[PDB]
Antibody
Framework: LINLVESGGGVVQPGRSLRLSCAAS????????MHWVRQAPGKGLEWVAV????????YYADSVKGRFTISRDNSKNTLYLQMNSLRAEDTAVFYC?????????????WGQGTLVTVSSASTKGPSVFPLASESTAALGCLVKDYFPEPVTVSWNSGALTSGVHTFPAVLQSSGLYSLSSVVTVPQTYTCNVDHKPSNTKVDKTV | GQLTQSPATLSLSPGERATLSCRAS??????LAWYQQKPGQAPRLLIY???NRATGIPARFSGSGSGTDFTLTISSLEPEDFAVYYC???????????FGQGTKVEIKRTVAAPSVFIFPPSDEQLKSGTASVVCLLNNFYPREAKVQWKVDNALQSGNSQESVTEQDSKDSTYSLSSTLTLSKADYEKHKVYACEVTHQGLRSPVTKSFNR
């Protein structure tokens, strides 16, 4: 019944801006205090800001004070977060949250989250390298230096799934991501790599 | 102001009882709330006011506590209950919410040693100026594992990054990837590349290596 849907997230360079939105439905929006909570990659939940139901009161985490501005529209029932002077450390999934009906010190509904990536990295497709006496053998593909997330990896157009492990991507110091996809075997092996951001497509036979 | 959750990770089998703890640094005015969160998904309210279940939350989830001590209990674990759990608090004023750092409820299974593999950088890649040496730890349990990189017997520190998969849906194991990054010039200056793995399932550490 109640629903919160966010949008506005995206990739941006340090010092620039972004405006996030959270459209509410299924409840009388104007009667509830609304918040923004973030979660940096691999970290826990972190409160960001709040705006009173009537929009007259706002409060911020010290780390965003003076840069971010929270506001709301009680006609279009939408919550906003204007983010200025963004830094690399602001990078995180941003969630809007509704103060609970039964208990306002809890968050009964959350938006799905929108990614805010603050980096000076350039949109780049990945280079795909092969990873080539024993009872079991391993092989795979090194999907290196791409940005931003995500990439999809399948083996033999999807026909091969057993024994496959596609690892979470890691942010190299260069600011570009890299990940490995492997398969163990006790046939031809081709990893299908797709990176939308750069409309890059590669089928690497290993 | 601060909420401490323990233990960091809870390893239990389906059907078992899970007891998660959250301790506030000072007495909380308003009883805490608990959230469940799965990888890549929004948190979801389980308990509020310390003991009240949110709508749609099954009876196996219960909560208790007051003052500085709160507990979240899952009477009997179902496969879909293995996730991360956070406790949360908030006051009228100031209005900022505080979150515990989370407790991961993980599936416990029999010990499984990882099979190890080491991959030299491809000539294709070397053709670009960089070298990535990869070490794979396939299907192991528990999660704790030690990966040590050595180049001509020099312990490598600070030039590797690793990644771990989520607990496998059918065998409940973990798999890990460790990538050692060296400039191509340095790669060519050394001969022996070794990845040593220490794990409970391995009665002796396992070393996989190659000579450039």
């Amino acid at each position: 019944l109640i629903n919160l849907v966010e949008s506005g997230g995206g990739v941006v360079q340090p010092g620039r801006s972004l405006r996030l939105s959270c459209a509410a439905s299924g409840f009388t929006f104007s009667r509830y205090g609304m918040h923004w909570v973030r979660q940096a990659p691999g970290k826990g939940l972190e409160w960001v800001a709040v705006v009173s139901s009537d929009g007259r009161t706002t409060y911020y985490a010290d780390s965003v004070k003076g840069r971010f501005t929270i506001s709301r529209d009680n006609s279009k029932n939408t919550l906003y977060l204007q983010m200025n002077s963004l830094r690399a450390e602001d990078t995180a999934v941003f969630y809007c949250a509704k103060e609970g009906g039964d208990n306002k010190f809890s968050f009964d509904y959350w938006g799905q989250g929108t990614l805010v990536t603050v980096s000076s990295a350039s949109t780049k497709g990945p280079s795909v390298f092969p990873l080539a006496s024993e009872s079991t053998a391993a092989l795979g593909c090194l999907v290196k230096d791409y940005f931003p997330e995500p990439v999809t990896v399948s083996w033999n157009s999807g026909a091969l799934t057993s024994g496959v492990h596609t690892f979470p991507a890691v942010l190299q110091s260069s600011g570009l991501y890299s990940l490995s996809s492997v398969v163990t075997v006790p046939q031809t092996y081709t990893c299908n790599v797709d990176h939308k951001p750069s409309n890059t497509k590669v089928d690497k036979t290993v | 102001g601060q909420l401490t959750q323990s233990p960091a990770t809870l390893s239990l089998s389906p059907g078992e009882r899970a007891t998660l703890s959250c301790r506030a640094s000072q007495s909380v005015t308003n009883y805490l709330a608990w959230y469940q969160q799965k990888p890549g998904q929004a948190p979801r309210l389980l308990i509020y006011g310390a003991s009240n279940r949110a709508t749609g939350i099954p009876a196996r989830f219960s909560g208790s506590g007051s003052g500085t001590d709160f507990t979240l209990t899952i009477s009997s674990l179902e496969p879909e209950d293995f996730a991360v759990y956070y406790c949360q608090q908030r006051d009228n004023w100031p209005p900022d919410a505080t979150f515990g750092q989370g407790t991961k409820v993980e599936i416990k299974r029999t010990v499984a040693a990882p099979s190890v593999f080491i991959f030299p950088p491809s000539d294709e890649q070397l053709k670009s100026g960089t070298a990535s040496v990869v070490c794979l730890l396939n299907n192991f349990y528990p999660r704790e594992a030690k990966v040590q990189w050595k180049v001509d017997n020099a312990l490598q520190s600070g030039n590797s990054q690793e990644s771990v998969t989520e607990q496998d849906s059918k065998d409940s194991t973990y798999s890990l990837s460790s990538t050692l990054t060296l400039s191509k010039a340095d790669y060519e200056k050394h001969k022996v590349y070794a990845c040593e793995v220490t794990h409970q399932g391995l009665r002796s550490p396992v070393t996989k290596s190659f000579n450039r």
